[PDB]
Amino acid sequence: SMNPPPPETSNPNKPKRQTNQLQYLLRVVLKTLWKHQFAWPFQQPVDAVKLNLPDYYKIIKTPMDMGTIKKRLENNYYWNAQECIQDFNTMFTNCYIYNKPGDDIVLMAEALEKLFLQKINELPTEE
Numbered sequence: 782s783m784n785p786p787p788p789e790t791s792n793p794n795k796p797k798r799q800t801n802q803l804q805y806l807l808r809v810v811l812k813t814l815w816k817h818q819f820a821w822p823f824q825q826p827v828d829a830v831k832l833n834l835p836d837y838y839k840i841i842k843t844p845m846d847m848g849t850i851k852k853r854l855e856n857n858y859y860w861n862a863q864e865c866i867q868d869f870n871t872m873f874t875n876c877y878i879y880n881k882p883g884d885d886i887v888l889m890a891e892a893l894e895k896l897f898l899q900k901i902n903e904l905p906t907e908e
């Protein structure tokens with residue numbers, strides 16, 4: 782049921798920046814979501830083989846998860862905050878594509894997304 786390689790968390794030829802907004806995304810946004818009671822499905826790439834979701838990566842062609850995001854932030858992988866925000870948005874939207882309203886995974890994504898947006902609304906202005 783083979784899994785694809787997980788998304789990269791480093792890329793030496795990719796140009797990178799550190800910004801106060803990206804630091805906030807790690808210290809506040811990622812850390813807050815990571816500790817949540819509904820974080821567990823999202824702390825690592827979907828193991829479609831072991832979870833018996835054989836069509837997961839047949840439907841989801843741009844997978845993303847908070848384990849990947851956490852390592853990207855720790856590795857200063859991003860050029861700007863928007864790039865990181867895009868990864869969270871991909872993670873949530875993949876759930877809404879793969880699953881139906883009311884599925885536990887969707888309820889979890891929705892709760893995390895609500896919290897994510899609350900924290901993003903307080904993103905500091907870039908210094």
Ligand SMILES: O=NC1=c2cc/c(=c3/nc(C4CCNCC4)[nH]c3=C3C=CNC=C3)cc2CC1
Pocket residue numbers: 821822823827828832875876879880886
């Ligand atoms: O859109 N579908 C998604 C989906 C489906 C299932 C899971 C999921 N992930 C796990 C992990 C938890 C840690 N141990 C390895 C397995 N376990 C599960 C799991 C197991 C049983 N029931 C629900 C989820 C994670 C996700 C993220 C997006």
